[PDB]
Amino acid sequence: PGTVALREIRRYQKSTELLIRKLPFQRLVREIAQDFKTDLRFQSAAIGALQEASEAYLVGLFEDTNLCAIHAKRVTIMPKDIQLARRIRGERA
């Protein structure tokens, strides 16, 4: 907090808080890059951005599904619920 701006620390902390393990995520991006016959490489920051945004997106999807679930007795979330929530709140991506 002398030579480092607090913003950067907030950022690194947030990186600490991700929910998907980083190695299998890496391997996922890897897989998609294989399927795309990509001749290219990815800078580590890009992978990071991908993961942050991806977990953001998934948690968002689930939030929307939660927000559309109104029942007298608590229900287990099933595919159809995701579908309907996505119709009501819209596709986030």
């Binding site: 030579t3 690194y12 890496q26 890897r30 920051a45 927000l67 608590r74 579908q83 996505r86």
Partner: protein, 207 residues
């Protein structure tokens, strides 16, 4: 208070070196093979960030200060939605529970409302309760989502992305790039819809 001063000087120096090395690692370009490697630059960056945060916490602990970094997601959400203060207090309590995973079900909110109304002994017409609870759950849930999203976009990326300006998108100029991006976008959307529907009709078949 001199050896302590020099100690915090050291720890802060180290914090800065950690930062510099993280900056360095973030810039590394990774081959398709590296993306399978357990010690790749991405994971090095990861563990380095971890140990950085640890050092930071140590410093806070050494400086009588708390380990908070002023995150938005830390900011207490207030709720004064219904004109029954006794319920507002309880809902506030619920949405600001300690934890990273304190996002409520509709059920949590309804239980809160029923509990408070029964405790503070008001006239609680059931249909009225259920409606009020549904509106509350929606309000509070929306705010929680907005907060997560702000927390995302405020602490997003790194120094490499910090210079983003929407109007410097080369796609605005180049019509070819814009066309490829257009076709791309249409595929993207139809693919997302494909999956959502796919699993929908799968659940349909199961039932």
């Amino acid at each position: 208070q001199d050896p302590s001063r020099r100690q915090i000087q050291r720890l802060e120096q180290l914090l800065a070196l950690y930062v510099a090395e993280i900056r360095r690692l973030q810039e590394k370009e990774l081959d398709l093979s590296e993306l399978d490697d357990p010690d790749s630059a991405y994971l090095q960056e990861a563990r380095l960030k971890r140990k950085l945060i640890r050092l930071f916490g140590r410093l806070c602990e050494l400086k009588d200060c708390s380990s908070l970094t002023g995150r938005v997601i830390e900011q207490r959400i207030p709720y004064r939605g219904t004109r029954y203060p006794e319920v507002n207090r309880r809902i506030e309590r619920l949405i600001n529970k300690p934890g990273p995973d304190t996002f409520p079900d509709y059920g949590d909110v309804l239980r809160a409302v029923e509990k408070a109304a029964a405790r503070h002994s008001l006239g609680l017409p059931r249909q009225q309760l259920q409606l009020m609870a549904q509106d509350a759950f929606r309000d509070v849930g929306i705010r929680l989502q907005e907060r997560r999203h702000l927390d995302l976009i405020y602490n997003f990326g790194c120094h490499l992305t910090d210079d983003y300006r929407p109007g410097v998108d080369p796609a605005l100029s180049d019509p070819v790039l814009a066309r490829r991006l257009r076709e791309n976008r249409s595929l993207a959307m139809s693919r997302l819809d494909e999956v959502i529907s796919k699993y929908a009709m799968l659940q349909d078949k199961s039932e």
